[PDB]
Design a protein around this ligand. Structure first.
Ligand SMILES: Nc1ccc(S(=O)(=O)Nc2ccccn2)cc1
Length: 185
């Protein structure tokens, strides 16, 4: 892929974060805290899951960014509609406004309904995410394996502005404390 030149500087939006997340001063890293982080509740915060949005909103053009997932056992990454549900239980699916992949229990899957098995030979330490708004495309790349394609959502019906989407995952096991980090350009 030659998508690197549509690189965008993504930062995390504290106001959208689940109340147990800790976002770094530079707004480029997020991790699960071991407790509530002493913030007020608001209607933007994801209540049920350890999720947070990027601050950037996209309604046109081509955008690319990279996320470091080193040593995590579980995570979700991609984009979502600005208007996705924040409270209660929900599925990650395009019907609900999400275009995502994830790691869970030693398998990688795309957030279709139902979910799609991914075939990754080299476990990724960094994931590249490409959005073409006009084409209706969201693609995922394995930066650890020379940028190899992981998955393409096509014929996407975005139906509104898009935001970068992150889930650091729970840490029931004590093996998933590591952060998600936005990688430098
Ligand atoms: N409906 C639902 C259930 C659990 C979760 S999760 O935050 O545990 N993260 C994930 C990620 C991939 C697979 C399972 N859980 C998110 C949404």
């Amino acid at each position: 892929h030659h998508h690197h030149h549509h690189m965008v500087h993504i930062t995390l939006d504290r106001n959208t974060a689940n109340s147990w997340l800790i976002i770094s001063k530079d707004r480029r890293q997020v991790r699960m805290g071991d407790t509530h982080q002493n913030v007020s509740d608001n209607k933007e915060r994801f209540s049920n899951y350890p999720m947070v949005l990027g601050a950037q909103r996209f309604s046109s053009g081509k955008m690319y960014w990279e996320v470091d997932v080193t040593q995590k056992e579980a995570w979700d990454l991609g984009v979502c509609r600005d208007s996705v549900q924040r409270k209660g239980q929900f599925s990650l699916s395009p019907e609900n406004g999400f275009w995502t992949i994830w790691l869970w229990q030693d398998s990688y899957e795309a957030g279709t309904s139902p979910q799609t098995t991914l075939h990754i030979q080299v476990p990724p330490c960094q994931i590249g995410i490409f959005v073409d708004y006009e084409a209706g495309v969201v693609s995922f790349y394995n930066i650890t394996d020379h940028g190899s394609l992981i998955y393409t959502f096509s014929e996407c019906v975005f139906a509104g502005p898009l935001r970068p989407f992150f889930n650091v995952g729970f840490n029931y096991s004590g093996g998933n404390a590591a952060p998600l980090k936005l990688c430098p350009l």
